[PDB]
């Protein structure tokens with residue numbers, strides 16, 4: 001588990017030197033980025049159950065073969081495990097947004113997931129579709145452009161951070177495929 | 178209008194309470210209430226709601242209960258079914 | 264999928280013992296009460312469509328607010344998902360009547376239903392209204408038989424007590 | 428009862444280690460965000476009665492069927508239990524604002540609420556309607572403050588995401 | 592409203608005289624063919640939903656261009672208007688079927704049909720496709736007596752020959 | 756998925772060589788002709804529905820026997836599969852216009868189409884009638900542009916030469 | 920009951936039936952599904968994968984092999 005700080009430190013350890021100027025300058029841009037990252041994680045957390053509900057329900061409604069008898073969503077217990085997994089994926093993405101580095105997302109959840117969904121017979125393209133729906137919904141919450149919720153924040157540009165969160169969801173969706 | 182109407186002279190009591198109530202007489206409505214165009218910034222004075230249900234909560238309830246989706250007869254579920262997919 | 268057979272096979276297997284006369288008496292009782300259960304399964308497979316239709320109709324007859332604002336069945340599509348779900352529950356009552364335990368109904372219908380239902384805003388009392396409607400729409404001599412009818416009631420009661 | 432202090436004390440205790448500078452930075456942040464949280468706690472302790480009253484009123488304004496048949500608030504007694512429950516949830520939002528974590532709200536309110544609510548046929552959507560009404564009845568400059576207002580919204584959103 | 596009794600009462604009224612034996616024979620024939628008419632009325636009131644369902648489904652089965660742009664029943668609402676209009680038609684076939692003269696079907700449905708359709712853009716041939724589907728589909732022997740079938744087909748034929 | 760980029764990267768990779776100036780000139784040409792291709796892709800994404808509808812309408816306008824006996828589109832459902840397939844072909848023409856090679860159209864549409872079409876009794880000449888109809892419904896200055904229009908013609912011609 | 924060896928080789932069942940407590944991704948990768956491969960009849964297929972392994976049960980890689 002490594003944040004931004006630990007990434008700078010471990011890279012400087014492989015380089016075998018002290019920390020220096022430019023790396024600390026980029027990390028100063030991280031700390032000044034600061035409350036935008038805080039409020040961003042607050043936006044993705046305080047809507048998260050609803051994101052998971054809408055995303056998995058959208059996954060089923062796009063592809064109705066999941067709910068067809070014999071599909072991997074066809075049962076209550078399969079559906080419960082489905083909702084549970086979508087909740088976990090959004091949880092580790094939120095951890096990767098607090099840390100600023102995807103080492104937590106790589107070590108906790110992404111490691112050994114493709115072989116797991118291969119082992120269970122979970123269709124991978126449907127999972128990548130659900131991850132993509134969580135991506136678009138999550139960036140729509142992070143720009144405060146949701147069509148059902150518009151909460152008050154002071155104005156500021158947040159393109160970079162949205163590209164960061166989209167990079168984590170593309171890491172997950174690229175990882176299951 | 179007798180040739181058109183035929184036998185359907187409506188009584189005064191039904192015609193007042195009919196569809197054309199506001200157009201049968203328009204005149205004698207006694208003291209129409211008028212709502213003034215207040216600015217939302219200034220509340221202008223002393224008003225107590227004096228209602229069982231709050232003004233905000235009641236407006237919320239009327240807006241939630243507003244218009245029921247009308248189930249129609251022909252989207253009704255048959256024996257078997259397949260759910261349509263977008 | 265729990266039944267008499269899987270209970271005594273699972274138990275004798277857990278002891279590591281050959282199946283003694285007690286297991287044989289258990290399956291003896293299974294083939295005693297079998298004819299009643301299969302009678303009720305045959306009749307349920309007879310008129311299931313009218314059962315599900317009357318069930319959902321009384322379900323929206325009680326709770327009309329679902330088709331009002333709704334954070335519920337708010338389209339004809341979602342009412343089709345309603346009658347689909349009642350088809351599933353009657354189909355699992357048919358399967359539990361054929362197996363003769365609550366096995367397939369529990370492992371396919373009941374297990375982890377609660378997370379789905381609290382996650383997707385689905386109230387349980389509407390389902391319970393539907394099943395209590397069907398249980399009140401039973402007949403003592405008319406539609407099934409006395410004793411098999413009791414079996415049917417038991418299964419549907421299990422569903423209600425698993426849902427409330 | 429989870430907070431900043433109990434998290435870093437519990438973690439450094441789990442390591443068996445004296446509290447390093449990291450824990451000190453954590454409690455430093457606690458005393459940074461403290462003033463906002465205490466502001467919202469003071470104003471919530473100011474007008475709690477109108478908050479609970481408007482909240483429950485909108486809760487029955489949406490779902491009228493509760494006071495109809497009802498397998499719900501079907502007496503003045505049960506409506507008293509209704510507004511008691513909304514008093515408890517607001518009291519726990521106040522407690523979680525003072526502690527500054529979701530500790531007392533989770534361990535007193537959220538833990539095992541689901542068994543009580545599915546056992547006593549209490550619908551969750553009514554509570555959710557109440558809290559979403561309160562969260563929409565917030566103000567950016569008017570009633571609390573911008574920043575602390577955000578803190579309050581977060582707490583209430585946690586309740587909603589724990590209930591749906 | 593045309594029937595046997597209204598025609599003969601209006602006839603002897605036109606002569607200004609009391610009803611002779613001829614009008615009595617006419618209403619005697621009315622109470623002869625009555626039971627066949629009302630048998631057809633009972634079965635039509637029985638299964639009207641399936642008749643209208645097959646009628647509209649075959650109506651769009653023959654003509655697909657109704658769901659094309661913007662020329663016809665292209666939206667869900669307009670197709671709902673289709674099914675409710677065929678509901679009115681079978682309701683008027685039931686009404687004139689009870690009366691036994693084509694009076695109420697004429698004065699309610701047929702009168703001013705043509706003026707309404709052209710301005711709106713409603714094709715009468717697709718209505719003809721629906722009714723001729725239901726005309727052909729019915730079996731004289733299986734779901735009713737031979738006489739009632741004839742009566743039903745006659746009424747429906749009137750609809751077609753009054754439409755286009 | 757073949758394009759300019761994948762061809763020169765795949766070739767220079769097959770040699771095990773760095774990308775020389777020749778590859779750079781190839782991608783230079785890709786970013787030269789890019790503007791035309793993306794113009795035709797934007798306009799195809801504009802009015803694809805009218806294109807597919809007129810295409811299939813002329814497809815059954817030529818070969819009427821399909822909707823006759825048919826061992827072909829013999830329902831409104833199969834005509835929906837018809838217009839779905841023409842939607843897929845136009846969607847792959849869009850994809851090949853965005854990529855700028857025949858890559859996704861060949862690997863998704865053309866590869867293995869022949870076994871499916873000879874297995875499911877689907878004649879190719881009807882598709883070819885549809886595409887030649889769309890290619891005759893092109894415009895020199897009007898709808899797209901001269902140059903990009905030519906690009907579109909080429910893509911559609913490739914489909915025809917892959918199908919006949 | 921089942922032998923301690925035999926349980927390692929066998930399988931992991933579905934959740935709501937076979938095991939109440941949900942399982943780590945580690946235990947699907949490491950134990951899982953464990954089938955050995957038969958001796959190759961061709962030169963091309965020999966040195967790519969190991970043969971049946973003893974006292975070890977791999978999982979989810981043996982699917983791909």
Ligand SMILES: C=CC1=C(C)[C@@H](Cc2[nH]c(/C=C3N=C(/C=C4\NC(=O)[C@H](C)[C@H]4CC)C(C)=C\3CCC(=O)O)c(CCC(=O)O)c2C)NC1=O
Pocket residue numbers: 066072073077078079081082083085086088089108109113116120122123126127130933934941942943944947
């Ligand atoms: C720490 C991270 C972490 C995860 C990410 C999950 C991943 C995960 N999911 C499942 C298991 C499962 N996951 C799903 C989910 C799916 N249902 C579908 O329709 C979709 C394809 C997909 C949701 C998008 C289902 C249905 C099961 C149960 C599969 C089965 O038993 O058939 C299992 C096996 C154990 C179990 O049954 O719960 C694991 C390890 N678990 C973890 O511990």
Ligand SMILES: C=CC1=C(C)[C@@H](Cc2[nH]c(/C=C3N=C(/C=C4\NC(=O)[C@H](C)[C@H]4CC)C(C)=C\3CCC(=O)O)c(CCC(=O)O)c2C)NC1=O
Pocket residue numbers: 035036037038039040042043142143144153154155156157158460574
């Ligand atoms: C402990 C938790 C914790 C948080 C969650 C944050 C929340 C937070 N954000 C801001 C403040 C801010 N937050 C944002 C963020 C946004 N920019 C946008 O384009 C988006 C809508 C959004 C990111 C998704 C911006 C732009 C400001 C400054 C607003 C302004 O000054 O106009 C402030 C006021 C103080 C400040 O200026 O930093 C606070 C308390 N702070 C905390 O202490």
Ligand SMILES: C=CC1=C(C)[C@@H](Cc2[nH]c(/C=C3N=C(/C=C4\NC(=O)[C@H](C)[C@H]4CC)C(C)=C\3CCC(=O)O)c(CCC(=O)O)c2C)NC1=O
Pocket residue numbers: 057060067073074075076079322329335336337341342344345346348351352371372379383385386389390
């Ligand atoms: C094997 C058993 C089995 C079941 C019993 C069902 C249970 C079930 N229902 C839904 C899903 C649903 N179920 C309903 C049904 C309801 N509509 C209402 O107005 C009523 C409250 C209620 C009927 C009485 C609706 C509306 C949805 C969709 C909910 C939504 O998307 O908002 C889902 C999620 C997947 C989906 O969208 O289909 C599941 C697992 N599925 C199964 O596999």
Ligand SMILES: C=CC1=C(C)[C@@H](Cc2[nH]c(/C=C3N=C(/C=C4\NC(=O)[C@H](C)[C@H]4CC)C(C)=C\3CCC(=O)O)c(CCC(=O)O)c2C)NC1=O
Pocket residue numbers: 306307310311313314317397400401402403404405406
């Ligand atoms: C497989 C399960 C299964 C059921 C649970 C029943 C349920 C059921 N009962 C009726 C229909 C009926 N059910 C009864 C039964 C009786 N009414 C009384 O007042 C008596 C107290 C009671 C007998 C003890 C009657 C009389 C009808 C016809 C009229 C009615 O609706 O009451 C109908 C409508 C179709 C019909 O008329 O038969 C249905 C679906 N049918 C099934 O196939």
Ligand SMILES: C=CC1=C(C)[C@@H](Cc2[nH]c(/C=C3N=C(/C=C4\NC(=O)[C@H](C)[C@H]4CC)C(C)=C\3CCC(=O)O)c(CCC(=O)O)c2C)NC1=O
Pocket residue numbers: 217232233470471472473474475477478481564565566567569570571
């Ligand atoms: C402790 C926390 C706490 C809050 C967050 C507030 C929330 C709150 N607001 C109002 C009440 C109100 N709140 C607003 C605010 C609004 N005006 C609008 O144009 C916007 C929609 C919105 C600001 C964004 C208004 C206008 C009223 C009065 C409503 C009325 O009387 O019609 C009331 C009822 C009592 C009153 O009239 O003051 C309450 C409890 N009060 C509290 O005690």
Ligand SMILES: C=CC1=C(C)[C@@H](Cc2[nH]c(/C=C3N=C(/C=C4\NC(=O)[C@H](C)[C@H]4CC)C(C)=C\3CCC(=O)O)c(CCC(=O)O)c2C)NC1=O
Pocket residue numbers: 483486493499500505506508509510512513515516535536543547549550553554557
């Ligand atoms: C510490 C926190 C804390 C809470 C939050 C409450 C939560 C709670 N409510 C009830 C119990 C109850 N709660 C309600 C409330 C409701 N009436 C309705 O119409 C609405 C849906 C809803 C108000 C919005 C009702 C009616 C009961 C009694 C239910 C019954 O007996 O049928 C119970 C069971 C014990 C009892 O009967 O009091 C509990 C634990 N109790 C606590 O100790």
Ligand SMILES: C=CC1=C(C)[C@@H](Cc2[nH]c(/C=C3N=C(/C=C4\NC(=O)[C@H](C)[C@H]4CC)C(C)=C\3CCC(=O)O)c(CCC(=O)O)c2C)NC1=O
Pocket residue numbers: 647650657663664665669670672673674676677679680699700707711713714717718721
């Ligand atoms: C008492 C008897 C009685 C009837 C029989 C109907 C007949 C009728 N239909 C429409 C009106 C309509 N009827 C239809 C129906 C059609 N849609 C199609 O695709 C098919 C061609 C056809 C069904 C088979 C449609 C679509 C409209 C609306 C037309 C429009 O607004 O464009 C109207 C005009 C008023 C309105 O918009 O509702 C009337 C009088 N109304 C009556 O009062």
Ligand SMILES: C=CC1=C(C)[C@@H](Cc2[nH]c(/C=C3N=C(/C=C4\NC(=O)[C@H](C)[C@H]4CC)C(C)=C\3CCC(=O)O)c(CCC(=O)O)c2C)NC1=O
Pocket residue numbers: 634635638639641642645725728729730731734
């Ligand atoms: C009120 C008037 C009224 C009618 C006129 C009928 C018309 C009608 N017939 C059928 C249904 C049917 N009708 C026939 C009849 C036919 N068998 C053939 O060999 C011939 C082509 C034809 C007799 C001349 C058959 C066979 C069915 C059943 C079709 C099937 O299930 O495949 C159905 C569907 C419901 C059902 O299965 O019964 C309906 C609505 N029903 C009504 O309510």
Ligand SMILES: C=CC1=C(C)[C@@H](Cc2[nH]c(/C=C3N=C(/C=C4\NC(=O)[C@H](C)[C@H]4CC)C(C)=C\3CCC(=O)O)c(CCC(=O)O)c2C)NC1=O
Pocket residue numbers: 811814821827828829833834836837838840841843844863864871875877878881882
């Ligand atoms: C990615 C690209 C892509 C395509 C282009 C289609 C091509 C395609 N069409 C069909 C299948 C079909 N395609 C048609 C279409 C036709 N109906 C007719 O009257 C005309 C001759 C023709 C429209 C012009 C029909 C009717 C079927 C079903 C054939 C049958 O089942 O008899 C199938 C078999 C699977 C299925 O049944 O859907 C496939 C692969 N599918 C794809 O994935």
Ligand SMILES: C=CC1=C(C)[C@@H](Cc2[nH]c(/C=C3N=C(/C=C4\NC(=O)[C@H](C)[C@H]4CC)C(C)=C\3CCC(=O)O)c(CCC(=O)O)c2C)NC1=O
Pocket residue numbers: 798799802803805806809889890892893894895896897898
């Ligand atoms: C992406 C591919 C693409 C196509 C292949 C065209 C195809 C196309 N052309 C028209 C429509 C038309 N196309 C033309 C073109 C002309 N008619 C003539 O007689 C001239 C010879 C010729 C110009 C050289 C004309 C005039 C119309 C409008 C009237 C008509 O149908 O002819 C329409 C109907 C919508 C409209 O009016 O614009 C469509 C779908 N559109 C597209 O978007």
Ligand SMILES: C=CC1=C(C)[C@@H](Cc2[nH]c(/C=C3N=C(/C=C4\NC(=O)[C@H](C)[C@H]4CC)C(C)=C\3CCC(=O)O)c(CCC(=O)O)c2C)NC1=O
Pocket residue numbers: 920921922923924925
């Ligand atoms: C639940 C099912 C189940 C089984 C089927 C067995 C299978 C089994 N057998 C052995 C173990 C053994 N099994 C045999 C049996 C054999 N002796 C021979 O001469 C023959 C080749 C063969 C009998 C036909 C022997 C000899 C051992 C001990 C091997 C040794 O220690 O060398 C072991 C290892 C543990 C042990 O030592 O007991 C296991 C798991 N165990 C189970 O739990």
Ligand SMILES: C=CC1=C(C)[C@@H](Cc2[nH]c(/C=C3N=C(/C=C4\NC(=O)[C@H](C)[C@H]4CC)C(C)=C\3CCC(=O)O)c(CCC(=O)O)c2C)NC1=O
Pocket residue numbers: 958959964965966967968969970971972973
């Ligand atoms: C066609 C002939 C043929 C062979 C001769 C083998 C030879 C072979 N074994 C391994 C690979 C292996 N071989 C074994 C076998 C075991 N290691 C132990 O310590 C145990 C004593 C023993 C089982 C009894 C193991 C465990 C591996 C993987 C790790 C290793 O190298 O030891 C590999 C590398 C590829 C792989 O991992 O599978 C190869 C080429 N494979 C073949 O296809």
Ligand SMILES: CCC1=C(C)[C@@H](CC2=N/C(=C\c3[nH]c(C[C@@H]4NC(=O)C(C)=C4CC)c(C)c3CCC(=O)O)C(CCC(=O)O)=C2C)NC1=O
Pocket residue numbers: 050051054055057058061062132133136137138140141145146147148149263
């Ligand atoms: C008929 C079957 C069906 C569904 C179910 C939806 C599901 C759905 N939601 C989306 C995407 C989506 N969903 C939400 C969340 C959602 N919107 C809100 O404003 C609030 C409060 C929400 C929870 C209640 C957001 C915020 C987005 C992003 C788009 C947007 O700005 O609204 C997307 C776009 C995916 C993408 O961009 O790739 C889909 C497909 N679509 C369907 O066809």
